[PDB]
Design a protein around this ligand. Structure first.
Ligand SMILES: NC(=O)c1ccc(S(=O)(=O)N(Cc2ccc(C(F)(F)F)cc2)[C@H]2CNC[C@@H]2NCc2cccc(O)c2)cc1
Ligand SMILES: [Cl-]
Ligand SMILES: [Cl-]
Ligand SMILES: [Cl-]
Lengths: 99, 99
């Protein structure tokens, strides 16, 4: 599809058996999801920007379904105000910016 | 152009006659630029970032060129990790997400 930017580009995703709403975010290096359980080992990470930094848990090799497109990669879990699909997963679904 | 997301989608912008590097950020509602001198009056604006909310300066109807494309619109000035071109101006230049 082609998604315009008049409003936030929100999509439904499936992660860890749960449906969530998330923002397709080209400014995000990482994918960042609100608190939830994920399988496997994790390690702590800090990410930051406007308003400062938050601590998150980094899980690797997590499968996410985004608009019918399955992709695998690292997911950070923590107190993000909005679920974010970042570049590490946007690349996997072949998402580009066009103008 | 078509910009893939394997690296940060950084482009050159021109604002106040000066070239700067900025990030095309679909997650950002607004355009936020590092401290610089802009003309006219400003109004207060609160924006919510990954780490929390901050106040920035809002300048309206500012001329800005993004990857060679001309836009005229609202630019916020404040402490930002990088210069950010958000949805307000991405929409002006006809930028869409495609997959
Ligand atoms: N209202 C707005 O216009 C406004 C909202 C949020 C932000 S933001 O939180 O700073 N922000 C932009 C951003 C851009 C670049 C960087 C960088 F380069 F330092 F890594 C860090 C952060 C947000 C906005 N979109 C990208 C980033 N997403 C959250 C985030 C934050 C940090 C790491 C992540 O993986 C993800 C900026 C602007
Ligand atoms: Cl990854
Ligand atoms: Cl590609
Ligand atoms: Cl605007």
């Amino acid at each position: 599809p082609q998604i315009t930017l008049w409003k936030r580009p929100l999509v439904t995703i499936k992660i860890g058996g749960q449906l969530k709403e998330a923002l397709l975010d080209t400014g995000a290096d990482d994918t960042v999801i609100e608190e939830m359980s994920l399988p496997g080992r994790w390690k702590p990470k800090m990410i930051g920007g406007i308003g400062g930094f938050i601590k998150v848990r980094q899980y690797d090799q997590i499968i996410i379904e985004i608009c019918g497109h399955k992709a695998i990669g690292t997911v950070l879990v923590g107190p993000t105000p909005v679920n974010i699909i970042g570049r590490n997963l946007l690349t996997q679904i072949g998402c580009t910016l066009n103008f």
